[PDB]
Amino acid sequence: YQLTCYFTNWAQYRPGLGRFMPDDINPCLCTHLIYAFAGMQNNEITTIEWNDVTLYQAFNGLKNKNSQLKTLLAIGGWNFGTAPFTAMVSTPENRQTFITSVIKFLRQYEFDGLDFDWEYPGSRGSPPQDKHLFTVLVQEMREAFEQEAKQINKPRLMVTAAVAAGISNIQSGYEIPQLSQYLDYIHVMTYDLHGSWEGYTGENSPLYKYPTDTGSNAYLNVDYVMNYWKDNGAPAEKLIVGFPTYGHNFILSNPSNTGIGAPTSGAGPAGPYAKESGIWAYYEICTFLKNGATQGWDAPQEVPYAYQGNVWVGYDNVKSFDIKAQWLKHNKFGGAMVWAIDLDDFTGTFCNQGKFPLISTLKKALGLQSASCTAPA
């Protein structure tokens, strides 16, 4: 199994114990590390943060401590939008310009591949033609990667994609069988499946449906989404299940109504470290629990929740990660990806479950505890 972990280049800006740099990553923890995010200018890949080059050096330098470790650069993200992607795929000339720039960039900064984080082809502003044009882009990149590997006689650069979990988004965004042929890995964003935008409490990443999930809401779980991808043309072994080391929080309309589907009045409070509206890092959730919150277990969906006063949080813990990992193995998927390494209790000081308790749980469950971790020759 692969264990693929996303690192975010804005985690450096978090105060005190929240600050997370490339050198805070345990090089032995994950099989793949992905750097979020890269941007685009004039159809060419670029940095985003002022110190990205320095961070690339430290990030990819982790491979000097684990000879097996592979790294990828993620282009796009939610704030990036679809506009530069649409413009870049719109003409073959723009695509060639992009692919050329990507090869140069990845080789220069010592990445082993590119992860497409276009959110999403065919939606969020992206026109209908982008569904097919994304397939074309991916194939062209893959084939360009294959050609380059032979000309310079080095291992081939990988091409992967983070892909939608919402059924409508999937249907308008991806030619699944064709896309699956050229992608090395398919990173399925099986989270953010519920949130305050809905007006009621719901789980970030429930494994199965809740009994009250009727109609289209019955698609809002990890099991349905992964099987949707598989059944519609993606090989199980290329499919990578998304695991969140963060939760979504809510303001309860009635503090005495604390179950799944309870009315909410909006997003819950930003955390003191991530400072994200309606989102808490796992280590931020541990503080919540330590400060007197009541623990809940959403049994049908195999995930925890917690509440105190008018604040309610749906998340993942050691127990839920373990359950999902067993499910993953039974279903013979390619492995797990994690958003994000910097949101797990990396110091171990918040949850008292050891360093990186959530990702370590995956490492153990997926048979990677004895994985080789030695500096290269």
Ligand X SMILES: Cc1[nH]c2ccccc2c1CN1CCN(c2ccccn2)CC1
Residues 120/187, Cβ–Cβ less than 8 Å: no
- Taking the least distance from each CB to ligand X, the nearer of 22 and 148 is 22
Using the rule CB under 6 A, give the single segment among 90-98, 129-137, 272-280, 367-375 that binds ligand X.
Answer: 272-280
Question: Which of the ranges 103-111, 121-129, 271-279, 345-353 carries the binding residues for ligand X, by CB under 6 A?
Answer: 271-279
CB neighbours of 149 closer than 8 A, spacing ≥ 6? Answer: 155, 156, 157
Of 78, 96, 309, 349, the one binding ligand X (CB under 6 A) is 78
Own/partner pairs for 20-25, CB < 8 Å, 24+ apart? 20/341, 20/342, 20/346, 21/55, 21/58, 22/55, 22/58, 22/59, 22/61, 22/62, 23/58, 24/342, 24/346, 25/59, 25/62, 25/341
Pick one of 339, 346, 350, 356: the residue that binds ligand X (CB under 6 A).
Answer: 339
What does the block give as tokens for 94?
């723009």
| Cα–Cα separations (whole angstroms), residue 163 to 77, 86, 166, 194, 229 | 11, 16, 9, 17, 10
Single residue of 49, 198, 276, 322 touching ligand X by CB under 6 A:
276
Out of 25, 114, 158, 274, point to the residue binding ligand X (CB under 6 A). Answer: 274
Q: Is 189 among the residues that bind ligand X (CB under 6 A)?
A: yes
17 CB-side CA count, 13 A: 13
> CA 316, CA 304: separation in Å to the nearest integer?
6
Of the candidate residues 140, 192, 298, 344, the single one contacting ligand X (CB under 6 A): 192
- Token pair of 100 as six digits: 């050329």
Site string for ligand X, 216-255 (x = CB under 6 A): ------------------------------x---------
Cα distance between residue 94 and residue 91, in whole Å:
5
CB 45 within 8 A of CB 98: yes
Of 44, 119, 140, 203, which residue is the catalytic one?
Answer: 119
Q: Does the annotation list 278 as a binding residue?
A: no
Nearer to ligand X, 148 or 206 (CB): 206
Count, residues near ligand X per rule CB under 6 A: 13
The answer to the question of whether 283 is labelled as a binding residue is no
3 binds ligand X (CB under 6 A): no
Catalytic residue status for 119? yes
Determine, following the binding rule CB under 6 A, whether residue 162 of this chain makes contact with ligand X: yes
Residues within the annotated binding site for chitin? Answer: 49-50, 76-79, 120, 189-192, 339
Catalytic residues: 119
Q: Which residues bind ligand X (CB under 6 A)?
A: 6, 77-78, 117, 162, 189, 192, 246, 274, 276, 279, 339, 343
